[PDB]
């Protein structure tokens, strides 16, 4: 059956975001007028948090704990699914086609994604999601 | 006069002596010495030419800027998109096989200790 | 029992729904309605592993055909090579009973 | 270390099978 559910971790392998870990927010298997193909509305993170040591200051700790996300429409053929699942209450319906057509709305969406993913990284789970892929 | 002559003191048709014929505004037919054509960069995994990257001679790339020499992607300007996709797939599947093998080793150890006890 | 494999493949393609080729097989697995997958022996290993990962996620059964792509195509009855094939509907074949 | 979180056969070869496919080789049939 359909494994490309809402809360589903994948990784983008083509484009500027190749090899970047991402999570689905809304699947569109039939496709809209624009994008006449099966696609997904997804949110990932561009720059992953950096490792922290005891030899550097608190401001540096915070700065390398910061996270910068991205939000995107991406083709299923350019995804490759991951068995893992990320459940986020903040990322319920943050993005839609209207947000991806209105630049202000997508800017607010990236701010929200940054806040929620920073909160989970501070919580301390899904370290596989928050670490970069080695390829 | 419709016949020309060399003007670089090298009288041999070597690949470093490539020339072409021009007609000057003075009405004379003479030769301009040309340089070698630039070669397109190729991918590292396969030998396909990388699209988007000027085909110039080596030092010329020093004058052009970084974005004119690259493509905004991992391994951009060194490997093609198909090869990058294959590398991502291979890395993920290698990690998956490692996880599966570790699960099998744990199950085998559990069976061994269950048989022992 | 490869003779039986070929006979039931011919029957299932004559009765039910069959798709051929990597892109069609991958689209069927993504749709999650494919009921059987066949992967040829000479299929590239990365392609094979990606297909097995997809089938494991979709819980769609997959079988490794003994012969190569040309043999799989000949058994399936068409005159071209088929590295991977997917069966969406069994028609009236017992290929899925086992 | 395999650090984990805190939250019908697929290969259907059509027709034990391993024992009856191994002990049924040419040399065993020949003896």
């Amino acid at each position: 059956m359909k494994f490309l559910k809402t809360s589903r971790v994948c990784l983008v392998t083509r484009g500027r975001y190749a090899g970047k870990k991402v999570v689905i927010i809304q699947p569109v298997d039939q496709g809209t007028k624009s994008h006449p193909y099966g696609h997904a509305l997804v949110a990932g993170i561009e720059r992953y948090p950096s490792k922290i040591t005891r030899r550097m200051s608190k401001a540096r700790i915070e700065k390398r704990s910061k996270i910068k996300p991205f939000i995107k429409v991406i083709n299923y053929n350019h995804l490759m699914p991951t068995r893992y699942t990320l459940e986020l209450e903040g990322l319920k319906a943050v993005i839609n086609a209207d947000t991806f057509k209105e630049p202000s709305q997508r800017e607010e969406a990236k701010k929200t994604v940054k806040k929620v993913l920073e909160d989970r990284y501070n919580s301390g789970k899904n370290r596989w999601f928050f670490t970069p892929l080695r390829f | 006069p419709t016949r020309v002559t060399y003007r670089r003191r090298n009288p041999y048709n070597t690949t470093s002596n490539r020339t072409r014929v021009i007609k000057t505004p003075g009405g004379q037919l003479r030769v301009l010495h040309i340089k070698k054509r630039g070669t397109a960069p190729k991918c590292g995994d396969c030998g396909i030419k990388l699209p988007g990257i000027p085909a110039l001679r080596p030092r010329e790339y020093a004058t052009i800027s970084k974005p004119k020499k690259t493509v905004q992607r991992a391994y951009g300007g060194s490997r093609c998109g198909n090869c990058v996709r294959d590398r991502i797939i291979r890395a993920f599947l290698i990690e998956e096989q490692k996880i599966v093998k570790k699960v099998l080793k744990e199950q085998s150890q559990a069976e061994k200790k269950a048989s022992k006890k | 029992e490869a003779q039986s494999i070929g006979a039931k493949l011919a029957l299932v393609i004559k009765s039910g729904k069959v798709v051929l080729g990597y892109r069609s097989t991958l689209k069927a697995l993504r749709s999650g309605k494919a009921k059987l997958i066949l992967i040829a022996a000479n299929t590239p290993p990365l392609r094979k592993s990606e297909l097995e990962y997809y089938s494991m996620m979709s819980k769609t059964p997959v079988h490794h055909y003994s012969g190569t792509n040309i043999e799989l195509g000949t058994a399936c009855g068409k005159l071209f090579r088929c590295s991977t094939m997917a069966i969406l509907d069994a028609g009236d074949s017992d290929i899925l009973a086992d | 270390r395999l650090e984990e979180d805190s939250s019908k056969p697929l290969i259907k070869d059509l027709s034990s099978k391993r024992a009856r496919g191994f002990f049924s080789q040419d040399v065993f049939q020949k003896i």
């Binding site: 068995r83 893992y84 699942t85 789970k125 899904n126 370290r127 596989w128 | 599947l93 290698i94 990690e95 998956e96 096989q97 490692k98 996880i99 599966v100 093998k101 570790k102 699960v103 099998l104 199950q107 | 290993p45 990365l46 094979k48 592993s49 097995e52 990962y53 089938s55 494991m56 996620m57 819980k59 997959v62 490794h64 | 270390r1 395999l2 650090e3 984990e4 979180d5 939250s7 056969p9 697929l10 290969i11």
Partner: peptide, 27 residues
């Protein structure tokens, strides 16, 4: 170096675990 293979995982509680797919890291 080896790729994913379903033959040595089939019909197993290990296959059940893999199909469950909880967060897993090999360190």
């Amino acid at each position: 170096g080896a790729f994913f293979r379903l033959k040595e995982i089939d019909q197993t509680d290990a296959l059940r675990r893999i199909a469950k797919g909880k967060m897993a890291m090999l360190t």
